[PDB]
Amino acid sequence: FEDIQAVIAEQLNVDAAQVTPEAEFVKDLGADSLDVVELIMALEEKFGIEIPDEQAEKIVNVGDVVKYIED
Amino acid sequence: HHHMVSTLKPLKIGKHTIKFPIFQGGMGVGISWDELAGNVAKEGALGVISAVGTGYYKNMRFVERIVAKKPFEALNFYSKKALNEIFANARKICGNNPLGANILYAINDYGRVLRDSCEAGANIIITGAGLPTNMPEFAKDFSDVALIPIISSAKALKILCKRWSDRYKRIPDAFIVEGPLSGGHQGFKYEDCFKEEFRLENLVPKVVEASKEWGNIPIIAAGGIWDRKDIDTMLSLGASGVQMATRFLGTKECDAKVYADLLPTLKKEDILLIKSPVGYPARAINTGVIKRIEEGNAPKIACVSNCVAPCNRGEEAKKVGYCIADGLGRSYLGNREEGLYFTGANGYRVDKIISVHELIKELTEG
Ligand SMILES: Cc1cc2nc3c(=O)[nH]c(=O)nc-3n(C[C@H](O)[C@H](O)[C@H](O)COP(=O)(O)O)c2cc1C
Ligand SMILES: *P(=O)(O)OCC(C)(C)[C@H](O)C(=O)NCCC(=O)NCCS
Ligand code: SF4
Incomplete structure (x- = not known):
């Protein structure tokens, strides 16, 4: 989780303390739609995964992303 | 006065060259079909066939199933047979002159319709109404087909290029930058469509600057471009071309003849x-x-036609009060009371309905 938090922090120019599994990228961390895509971009490299858009549209809070990396 | 030659230079996008750097913008449900697009391409510009709602063609002559006088589901709303027929009759007019197919990214069965358009013989595919990161997945068997996303920011350009290279080992053949004065769906939130920050003249240089970073992808400015004076303005700012629609909406060759009645x-x-x-x-x-x-x-x-994914099957249609498939189809059929009609912001400047030939000449002389 600490690695997910670090990419989310650096990408959105936001402290690791705000990146809580409840915090929503839309509302809490202050990201526009393309910030979201860049972020997905950075996560699927960092952890060598692919997140399809269909799967990706569903995630709004960092827990949703954390859980997807998990499985 | 005779017809004079153009100081505008021909435009290369894919393997295809068009004599004049002007796209006629795709206009959804029967506005830019065979007559319009074929004549525009015959005159040396890029004709663009709208692939949306082709089931309505010739009052649904080529559908297998009609529910409530509407094409049933995406298979009939996006009728391949109809699309094939539109392209064939367009090529009766333009021959082998390049043609685009315009496909909104938001549609259900997007990939099938992209493929349909290639098999119908489109040279170029143009796609807006979204961030089309998966345009190429269905084009993989059509190497000759050029792909053009519609964007509203340099940010979108960078994202698209990266995601395309990653997934498809391809980069777009061009980008259309569509400003907020365009007809149909805007690429900005309601609020933002008024700011000065987004005018077309401020966006084009930013997108052009960002595109150089990727081998100088051609940039086509769209939205509010009215005459040759505007064309040259956009080209001076770095656009490789322009896309216009309202003006062509004001032509006689337009396929939805009701507009020849309503714009003036x-x-x-x-x-x-x-x-x-x-x-x-x-x-x-x-x-x-x-x-x-x-x-x-x-x-x-x-919800009979199920045209677009974001509506969720009539849910957002009810939230906004109308069905866009029914409205646009009704307009093509000539229904003045229940049709939905689109226009660019310059629509009100239309007073005479002119031929496509005469329009293209006025834009290209000297
Ligand atoms: C009636 C009408 C229908 C349109 N439908 C579509 C469409 O189906 N798909 C699309 O990408 N753009 C659509 N547009 C946008 C045009 O393709 C074009 O990019 C834009 O209108 C250019 O601005 P102008 O009309 O001021 O020249 C439409 C525009 C008009 C006016
Ligand atoms: P975000 O996911 O809210 O942003 C969507 C964006 C702006 C990325 C998308 O590129 C867009 O809106 N593109 C414009 C498509 C268009 O201009 N027209 C369709 C004409 S009917
Ligand atoms: S209800 Fe929505 S999805 Fe169904 S045809 Fe109408 S606009 Fe399209």
Whole structure:
């Protein structure tokens, strides 16, 4: 989780303390739609995964992303 | 005075060259079909066939199933047979001159329709109404087909290029930058469509600058471009070309003949920006279904054609009061009371309906 938090922090120019599994990228961390895509971009490299858009549209809070990396 | 040659230079996008750097923008449900697009391409510009709602062609001559006088589901709303026939009759007019197919990214069965368009013989595919990161997955068997996303930011350009290279080992053959004065769906949130920050003249240089970073992808400016004076303005700012639609909406060759009747009367204040089941703002005329909703006597919503994914099957149509598939199809059929009608912000400047030939000449002389 600490690695997910670090990419989310650096990408959105936001402290690791705000990146809580409840915090929503839309509302809490202050990201526009393309910030979201860049972020997905950075996560699927960092952890060598692919997140399809269909799967990706569903995630709004960092827990949703954390859980997807998990499985 | 005779017809004079163009100081505008021909435009290369894919393997295809068009004599004049002008796209005729795709216009959804029967506005830019075979007659319009074929004549525009015959005159040396890029004709663009709209692939949306082709089931309505010739009053649904080529559908297998009709429910409630509407094409049933995406298979019939996007009729391959109809699309094939539109392209064939367009090529009766233009021959082998390049043609685009315009496909909104938001549609259900997007990939199938992209493929359909390639098999119908499109040279170029143009796609807006979304961030089309998966345009190439269906084109993999059509190497000769050029792919053009519609964007509203340099940010979008960078994202698209990276995702395309990653997934498809391809980069777009060009980008259309569509500003907020365009017809149909806007690529900005309602609020942002008024700021000065987004005018087309401020966006084009930024997108051009960002595109150089990727081997100088051609940039085509769209939205509010009216005459040659505007064309040269956009080209001086770095655009490789322009895309226009309202002007061609004002031609006789336009496929939805009702517009030849409605634009000359259009007042500027009857052009509104409205909500849409597609989830973008849309610029429309204060007529048809829009007046019926104002009166409370608008048509029943019953999702038959299932045209776009973001609406969720009539849900957002009900939230906004109208079905865009029914409205646009009704307009092509000539229904003045229940049709939905679109226009660019310059629609009100239309007073004479002119031929495509005469329009292309006025834009290209000298
Ligand atoms: C009636 C009408 C229908 C349109 N439909 C579509 C469409 O289906 N797909 C699309 O990408 N753009 C659509 N647009 C946008 C045009 O293709 C074009 O990019 C834009 O209108 C250019 O601005 P102008 O009309 O001021 O020249 C439409 C525009 C008009 C006016
Ligand atoms: P975000 O996911 O809210 O942003 C969507 C964006 C702006 C990325 C998308 O590129 C867009 O809106 N493109 C414009 C498509 C268009 O201009 N027209 C369709 C004409 S009917
Ligand atoms: S209800 Fe929505 S999805 Fe169904 S045809 Fe109408 S606009 Fe399209």
